[PDB]
Design a protein around this ligand. Structure first.
Ligand SMILES: [Mg+2]
Ligand SMILES: [Mg+2]
Ligand SMILES: [Mg+2]
Ligand SMILES: [Mg+2]
Ligand SMILES: [Mg+2]
Ligand SMILES: [Mg+2]
Ligand SMILES: [Mg+2]
Ligand SMILES: [Mg+2]
Ligand SMILES: [Mg+2]
Ligand SMILES: [Mg+2]
Ligand SMILES: [Mg+2]
Ligand SMILES: [Mg+2]
Ligand SMILES: [Zn+2]
Ligand SMILES: [Zn+2]
Lengths: 99, 177, 162, 266, 38, 42, 40, 71, 38
RNA sequence: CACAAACGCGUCUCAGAGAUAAUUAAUGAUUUAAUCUUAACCUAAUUAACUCAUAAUAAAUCCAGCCCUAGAACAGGGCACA
């Protein structure tokens, strides 16, 4: 019974571990986890927590590139909200459709 | 990148000594980042079973600051086990008795309630003032930024800034101060 | 600014008033149409205990507050600044706005404990020995409730009791 | 090679001795009262080692004093090496006295019972008479149960030990155990007589411990008797410093001497 | 089981408490305080 | 004054030896980031 | 997370919803011939 | 960067007999009790005193003789 | 002193002052009017 | 009290500093008077607690046998004067 329950909880435990690692590597770049995740989603970069943790552990430069992209998207969104103008759009804030 | 297995392991799981100034800083905000560093939640290689943990040296403990009236309201309760041996000491009295005790108890509280808490506490060094032994000073890697911005007093303000700040109101000449 | 001068010359007391030069208001305020000082200078919901350059403008040299009929503030802001001045004085700012006592400065006492955002007086609050359980919790109040209308860039409300 | 002798200061403290408790004697006072004195014989007191203030406590230095001589054949190798480097035979009881920095004495210096003068208050530390594993009535003084009113196997039992709701006994519960073999201190014991030839101190009142045991004597630390070391020899008693032999018996101003006119009231 | 009307304020069900908190009155707040507005 | 390689170690001598090994590997082209072996049919 | 942003942009609340990450064939033969279709 | 510190000092060298001087740097040994040794180890490695105590037969028998290894 | 929950002036010479975290009705002419807010 | 000991009914000793709650007054604005101040500055008279000076232990690896005022066993103190 404990084996079945722990098999169910293993996914949650490993997801929490990946989230903790992504945080660690994010505040190591001076960026918070919620902002990093939302700005990575806004860039249509659909990398799950496991892959993000793998990149954080073994690809420091790639993870720093991802953090820089997420941050840049964050200032782009903040500037768009401050300006409140339909015409001014950021470079990385453009949305691409399916093809 | 192209290291041998043993040096790569040592570099990955090496211990780091951090410095933390405690002058005019809240114990909760200091000890929260302290607990983060002791657990190792700042490492992407972190795991509960692994022994990933770094040392933290907190200085200027005697000059700590409490927000609000916590100095007179916050209490610390202990019991010696013997009947009638239940003591409740105010935060001010506890700080006057032992300056280290405040931050020590805050870190102990925010550390996990597992058996590893004692192990990570043994890696914590707290000093009331800027008097750190050389053997520990030679281990420091970096100093973490203060979590709270210390406000300046009136005399600490520069005269050019004082003149730049406008006078909102004009006092009358007939009034006496 | 007026000053009372007393001269003692052979069983004779001379009390005289002296008028000195006083600084005036800056020429260009952002909002000249406001009658009230802070909320014509556009500082409403902007100042705090950290802001000493604004709190120190209208206070007596001995740390006392100044009358509203002389200052000109609207009542809410007068009360807010009274609370802020009390908070700064208890926190340890405004070091030169203390009375000068040559006798009491030699017998030093216990070091002044650092504090900030303190609401009550340090000598009037009794320590909470029961501290309450989770459902009924006796909080330690931090900061004055009059400062709840200040601008919050983060957007989160200010925790006045913790 | 004596160490420099510093002048006495009001905040200074003095070194003690380690004597041997001989017995008890009566002693009458000039007002007709009868006191009981205990005999403390200073056989062999020597300063063994000196620990500096910062390396011992940070407030006061420590001087180590040895007691009565013992045999070399039953001591350990390290103790024998220490006494070999010191140049003195091994001692039985080795104690530590907390002294001020101005009353330090070179190790290897002997101490004599004339270190205390007639009229003074001393504190006595020793292991009391160990009565072994004793019952609760003799250890804590609890009242027993009635002996013959039907009580069954309960005449000396402690009875209830705790409370039903607590479901446990408190750590401060009084119960039978070891009694006596522990270091106790008696404070404010007046000294009436100092015998110089045999090095004997007559201390008023009872002394904790059996006869012929080693006893640690020091000044009284009571707040009422804090500053009586002014008239007393500050570093210690040096018989060679004065170049004058003290009288055989040093008496107090109230002790009725054995040679007395058989005082009568008027 | 208590009556419909009681003296102890009849501590309320959680969803009704949430409903009351949501439907609490919100006074109209002007942009500028009219006291020392012109 | 140009960094060609770096190496970690428990002691300074071991760290220097590891740095020399890393520089040697970089010079010889045998690096962890090198081209994987070509397994194809020419 | 990020569901409201995707709903505003028109994509599904879940990246698994009708997106190219799931609709496209995730593998094919090295020759280039199409793979057997997916049961889902 | 900073230069590499180098510490090379041999104070055990004797001008009379270097053969004995060489053993003067190798004849250093020390032995302590369990308590003091565990305290010294805990102080040196910044850990607790309970880690260095041994374990029983039940735990020593159940350890895997050939644990799996990756890489 | 009398400890009370509600304080009132029993004469025109009483004055109300906040001290030690409580309210105090102090009277000099009639000392029996001394009231302390509990 | 028919043991060298134990015992009371017999004898000896028993303490300095800080700190406070209630409550008094000095100085002083909001409220240029006054006002002990969930206004500051130093204030002074102040309960019991509670901590701290101070006091006790606080020299590691000889232990076969024999004594002990040391002890259930294990431990601990002695075995050179004589
Ligand atoms: Mg599932
Ligand atoms: Mg016995
Ligand atoms: Mg009886
Ligand atoms: Mg019966
Ligand atoms: Mg019977
Ligand atoms: Mg029966
Ligand atoms: Mg229980
Ligand atoms: Mg019903
Ligand atoms: Mg006045
Ligand atoms: Mg008056
Ligand atoms: Mg103490
Ligand atoms: Mg022995
Ligand atoms: Zn206004
Ligand atoms: Zn009245």
């Amino acid at each position: 019974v404990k084996c079945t329950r722990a098999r169910r909880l293993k996914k949650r435990s490993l997801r929490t571990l990946w989230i903790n690692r992504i945080t660690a590597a994010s505040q190591e770049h001076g960026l918070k986890y919620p902002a990093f995740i939302i700005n990575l989603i806004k860039c249509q970069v659909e990398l799950n927590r496991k892959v993000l943790a793998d990149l954080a552990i073994y690809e420091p430069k790639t993870f720093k590139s991802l953090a820089a992209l997420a941050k840049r998207r964050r200032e782009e969104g903040f500037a768009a909200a401050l300006g409140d103008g339909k015409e001014p759009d950021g470079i990385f804030s453009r949305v691409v459709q399916h093809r | 990148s192209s290291f041998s297995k043993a040096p790569q392991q040592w570099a990955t799981f090496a211990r780091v000594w951090y410095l933390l100034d405690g002058k005019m800083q809240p114990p909760g905000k200091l000890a929260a980042m302290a607990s983060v560093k002791l657990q190792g939640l700042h490492k992407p290689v972190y795991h509960q079973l692994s022994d990933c943990g770094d040392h933290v040296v907190i200085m200027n403990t005697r000059h700590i600051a409490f927000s609000g009236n916590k100095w007179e309201q916050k209490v610390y309760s202990s019991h010696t086990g013997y009947p009638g041996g239940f003591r409740q000491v105010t935060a001010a009295q506890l700080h006057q008795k032992d300056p280290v005790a405040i931050v020590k108890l805050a870190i102990y509280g925010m550390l996990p309630k597992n058996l590893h808490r004692r192990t990570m506490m043994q890696r914590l060094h707290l000093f009331p003032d800027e008097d750190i032994p050389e053997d520990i000073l030679k281990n420091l890697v970096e100093e973490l930024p203060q979590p709270r911005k210390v406000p300046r007093r009136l005399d600490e303000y520069t005269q050019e800034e004082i003149e730049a700040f406008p006078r909102v109101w004009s006092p009358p000449e007939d009034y006496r101060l | 600014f007026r000053e009372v001068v007393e001269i003692l010359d052979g069983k004779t007391t001379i009390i005289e008033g002296r008028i000195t030069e006083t600084p005036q208001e800056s020429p260009n305020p952002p909002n000249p149409t406001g009658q009230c000082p802070i909320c014509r200078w556009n500082l409403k919901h902007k100042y705090n205990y950290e802001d000493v350059l604004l709190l120190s403008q209208f206070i007596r040299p001995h740390g006392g507050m100044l009358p509203r009929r002389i200052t000109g503030l609207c009542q809410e802001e007068h009360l807010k600044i009274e609370e802020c001045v009390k908070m700064a004085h208890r926190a340890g700012l405004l070091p030169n706005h203390r009375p000068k006592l040559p006798e009491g400065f030699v017998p030093k006492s216990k070091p002044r404990l650092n504090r900030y955002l303190t609401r009550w007086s340090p000598r009037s609050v009794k320590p909470i020995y029961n501290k309450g359980h989770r459902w009924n919790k006796v909080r330690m109040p931090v900061g004055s409730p009059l400062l709840k209308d200040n601008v919050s860039y983060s957007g989160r409300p200010l925790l006045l009791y913790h | 090679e004596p160490w420099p002798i510093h002048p006495w200061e009001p905040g200074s403290s003095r070194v003690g001795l380690i004597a041997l408790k001989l017995g008890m004697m009566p002693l009458w006072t000039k007002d007709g009262q009868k006191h009981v004195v205990t005999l403390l014989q200073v056989q062999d007191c020597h300063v063994l080692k000196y620990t500096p203030k910062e390396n011992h406590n940070g407030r006061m230095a420590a001087l180590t004093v040895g007691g009565k001589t013992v045999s070399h054949f039953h001591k350990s190798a390290s103790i024998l090496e220490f006494y070999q480097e010191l140049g003195l035979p091994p001692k039985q009881k080795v104690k530590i006295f907390n002294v001020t920095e101005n009353a330090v004495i070179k190790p290897g210096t002997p101490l004599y019972a004339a270190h205390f003068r007639p009229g003074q208050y001393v504190d006595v530390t020793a292991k009391t008479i160990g009565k072994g594993f004793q019952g609760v009535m003799r250890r804590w003084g609890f009242k027993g149960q009635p002996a013959t009113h039907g009580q069954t196997k309960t005449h000396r039992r402690p009875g209830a030990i705790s409370t039903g709701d607590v479901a446990r006994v408190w750590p401060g519960t009084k119960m039978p155990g070891q009694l006596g073999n522990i270091d106790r201190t008696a404070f404010g014991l007046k000294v009436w007589r100092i015998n110089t030839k045999h090095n004997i101190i007559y201390v008023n009142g009872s002394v904790p411990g059996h006869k012929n045991c080693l006893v640690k004597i020091k000044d009284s630390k009571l707040p009422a008797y804090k500053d009586f070391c002014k008239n007393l020899p500050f570093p210690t008693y040096f018989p060679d410093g004065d170049e004058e032999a003290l009288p055989e018996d040093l008496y107090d101003e109230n002790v009725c001497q054995p040679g007395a006119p058989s005082i009568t009231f008027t | 089981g208590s009556k419909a009307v009681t003296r102890h304020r009849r501590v309320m069900h959680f969803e009704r408490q949430k409903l009351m908190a949501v439907t609490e009155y919100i006074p109209p707040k002007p942009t500028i305080n009219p006291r020392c507005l012109p | 004054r140009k960094l060609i390689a770096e190496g970690p170690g428990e002691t300074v001598l071991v760290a220097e030896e590891e740095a020399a090994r890393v520089a040697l590997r970089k010079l010889f082209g045998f690096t962890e980031n090198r081209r994987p072996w070509d397994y194809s049919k020419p | 997370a990020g569901s409201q942003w995707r709903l505003q942009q028109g994509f599904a609340a879940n990246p698994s919803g009708y997106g190219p990450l799931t609709e496209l064939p995730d593998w094919s033969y090295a020759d280039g011939r199409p793979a057997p279709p997916m049961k889902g | 960067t900073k230069p590499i510190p180098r510490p090379d000092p041999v104070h055990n060298i004797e001008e009379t007999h270097d053969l004995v001087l060489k053993t003067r740097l190798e004849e250093k040994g020390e032995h302590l009790e369990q308590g003091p040794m565990i305290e010294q180890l805990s102080k040196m490695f910044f850990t607790t005193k309970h880690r260095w105590y041994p374990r029983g037969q039940y735990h020593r028998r159940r350890r895997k003789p050939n644990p799996p290894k990756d890489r | 002193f009398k400890t009370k929950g509600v304080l009132k002036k029993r004469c025109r010479d009483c004055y109300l002052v906040k001290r030690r975290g409580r309210w105090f009705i102090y009277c000099k002419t009639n000392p029996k009017h001394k009231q302390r807010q509990m």
